[PDB]
Amino acid sequence: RSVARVYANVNEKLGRSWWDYDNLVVQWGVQDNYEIVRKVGRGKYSEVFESIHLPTDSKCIVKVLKPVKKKKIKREIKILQNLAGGPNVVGLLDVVRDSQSKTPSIVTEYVNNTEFKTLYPKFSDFDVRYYIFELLKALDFCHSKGIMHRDVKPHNVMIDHEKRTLRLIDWGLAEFYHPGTEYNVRVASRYFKGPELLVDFQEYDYSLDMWSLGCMFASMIFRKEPFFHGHDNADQLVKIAKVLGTDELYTYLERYDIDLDAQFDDILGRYPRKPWSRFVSSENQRYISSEAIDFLDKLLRYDHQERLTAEEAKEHPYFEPVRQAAA
Ligand SMILES: Nc1ncnc2c1ncn2[C@@H]1O[C@H](COP(=O)(O)OP(=O)(O)NP(=O)(O)O)[C@@H](O)[C@H]1O
Question: Whose CA is nearest to atom 5 of ligand 1?
Fold first, then answer.
């Protein structure tokens, strides 16, 4: 009941060799070439440690996957393998596992990150333009290769501000895009979930990541994290409606023939479109420009087919200072 505007054809054109991650044979590395040092992060499905690849004595990242459906492990590995050498995608170094328990780990390149709540407010307007544009290179790449990231949130973007370098990480929710496939809507982080997830519209595509990038981008330029701050997946849709308005929400549901949950209507009610200008203040004015708002406004749409493609987004006037500086 939806197909993507772009890249709908990719997985058909690349082999079954490219998306059939169920039939992947995993060449496990050697567990004991890696020694864990320092625990640096935590997810619901993973341990992340700073570690050493002992033979090279190299700092790397080991991510210990909570034993979970083997199918899912097979998917993340094949995706990482596929995307290899792509711009600003985290480098996959190894896959290992325990001899006895068979608990797998992914070994990835280390990135000297700064936590975003500290790093983002140190940003200039050029900085935001530059790093979003480098994030747009990763989304455009992986989308061009039939893959939706599906967890694009600042926690999964690692920025080394001294090297001026960027990596997208946590491809644990990523999928291959197949035209017409119904996908699980329980993806993303509540704050970065697109409306299509919140109304249980299952036939979504790469445009999910663009909404997500929009929320992240609104955090940065408006200095509100999160920009939409829902207490649960129901309230999340309400916080979105208080900004984009409900008039546009009902034309969107009507256009895609979504019927809402019955008790959604005790809580939603009627909201006029709050304009983007009403979010400007003295403390966030540094990031604000007529180009930024226009760009943000073409990511944050109810209808996933009115959103920019990562490629169209790269052409936007907002990124002209970074394109120019490139040369
Ligand atoms: N390559 C890396 N370099 C540095 N830190 C990293 C790297 N990969 C992951 N981390 C840290 O580990 C945290 C969790 O890693 P992540 O890959 O997001 O695992 P997860 O279990 O999928 N968690 P979640 O994002 O909630 O789904 C990240 O937020 C980073 O702070």
Answer: 111
